[PDB]
Each structure stands twice: as C-alpha cells, then as structure tokens.
Amino acid sequence: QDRFLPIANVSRIMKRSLPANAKISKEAKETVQECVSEFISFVTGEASDKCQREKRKTINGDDLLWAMTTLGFEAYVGPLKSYLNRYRE
Amino acid sequence: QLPLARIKKIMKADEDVRMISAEAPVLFAKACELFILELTIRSWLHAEENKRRTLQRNDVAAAIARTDVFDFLVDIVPR
C-alpha cells in the first residue's frame, strides 16, 4: 500500500463531506483511496499531452487546469485557478 | 492535507511526465480534495437511498456508475 495517498488522509477528507454520525466502511475508504490515484494518473496523462504538444519540459499548474477542463471537471477549475494564482503571487 | 511528495510520485508514473513544476503537486493536492469530497457525497446519496448510515463500497460503485465525469473509474469499482 504505497502506490496510494495515505488511507487516513483520504478518509479524513471523506468524513468532512458527511453528517457527523455517518460511518464509512474500510472497503469504501480503500475504494476511494484507489480512485484518487486513478484521478491523478488520468489528469496527468492529459496534462502531459498538453505540455508535450506545446514543446515544454515541465508540467505546470496551467497544464493541470487545462486537463481538468478537457476531462470534464469544469466545476473544480474556477476555484483551482484562483488558488493557483494566489500560490504564484 | 495530502503529502506533496506522494502526489509527485504518482504523477511521475506517467509516460511523458518529465519534469514537474513545484506548483503542480500543490494544485493537485487541492484538486484531489475536491474530487474526494464530490465522490464521497455522491456515494452517500446511494447509502441514504438504501436506508443506511454506513457508506459502503457498493455506494461508491453506484455513484461512479451514474456519474459521467467518473466514467474513467467504472472498471476500477464495478458494482
């Protein structure tokens, strides 16, 4: 178990979206943990194609934002773009 | 919230991944948070439809199966 983000960190975020008395089974946590790694690999492949098409060597945050837009995560891109602009300032 | 070094490691498993700006794992950490939150609440809706207060694997599979954005996960988490 090290191809993955740590299970407790993932599960702590899961728990924040639920009622305080919600329970999460260990198999659900493990499932979401695997899904998060697939999310990273999925989005990275797209951003990599972008980075390479434009003859650059380094995946940056704009590459990721473009990748998330292309792959249909438009609901995240606005807030991530604002987050990225503040990190860069 | 999510360790940047591990994100970078998962990123580097990619074919053309090459170099990675420092900002990219940072931005990714936030993106993974948004993804976990959305996947989890969509799964909870299936648990509440089955009259349960425990979120189970089949709830994640159900949410993935009925969400077009999560199409890339349908074979990872089959019902």
UniProtKB/Swiss-Prot annotation, chain A:
Give tissue specificity per the record: Expressed in roots, culms, nodes, leaf blades, leaf sheaths and young panicles.
Full protein name: Nuclear transcription factor Y subunit B-11
**What is the gene name?**
HD5
Natural source organism? Oryza sativa subsp. japonica
The entry's DNA-binding region feature spans 5-11
Question: Subcellular localization, per the record?
Answer: Nucleus; Cytoplasm
Q: Which residues of the full protein are shown?
A: 59 to 147 of 297
Which family is annotated? Answer: Belongs to the NFYB/HAP3 subunit family.
What is known about what this protein does?
Answer: Probable transcription factor involved in the regulation of flowering time under long day (LD) conditions. Functions as a repressor of flowering, independently of HD1 and GHD7. Controls flowering time by negatively regulating the expression of EHD1 and HD3A. Regulates plant height by promoting cell elongation in the internodes. Component of the NF-Y/HAP transcription factor complex.
Tree of life domain: Eukaryota
Which proteins does it associate with, and in what oligomeric form?
Heterotrimeric transcription factor composed of three components, NF-YA, NF-YB and NF-YC. NF-YB and NF-YC must interact and dimerize for NF-YA association and DNA binding. Interacts with NFYC2, NFYC4 and NFYC6.
Any phenotype upon disruption?
Answer: Early flowering phenotype under long day (LD) and natural day (ND) conditions. Decreased plant size, number of grains per panicle, yield and dry weight per plant.
- Region named Subunit association domain (SAD): 32-43
Its induction note reads: Circadian-regulation under long day (LD) conditions. Expression increases in the middle of daytime, peaks around the end of the light period and gradually decreases during the dark period and beginning of daylight.
Swiss-Prot record, chain B:
- Where, per UniProt, does this protein localize? Nucleus; Cytoplasm
S-S bonds:
none
Induction annotation: Circadian-regulation under long day (LD) conditions. Expression increases at the end of the dark period, peaks in the beginning of the light period and gradually decreases during daytime.
Q: What does this protein do?
A: Probable transcription factor involved in the regulation of flowering time under long day (LD) conditions. Functions as a repressor of flowering, independently of HD1 and GHD7. Controls flowering time by negatively regulating the expression of EHD1 and HD3A. Component of the NF-Y/HAP transcription factor complex.
Q: What is stated as this protein's family in its record?
A: Belongs to the NFYC/HAP5 subunit family.
What quaternary structure, including any partners, is listed in this protein's UniProt entry? Heterotrimeric transcription factor composed of three components, NF-YA, NF-YB and NF-YC. NF-YB and NF-YC must interact and dimerize for NF-YA association and DNA binding. Interacts with NFYB8, NFYB10 and HD5/NFYB11.
Listed name of the protein: Nuclear transcription factor Y subunit C-2
What species is given as this protein's source? Oryza sativa subsp. japonica
List the range of the whole protein covered here. Answer: 69 to 147 of 246
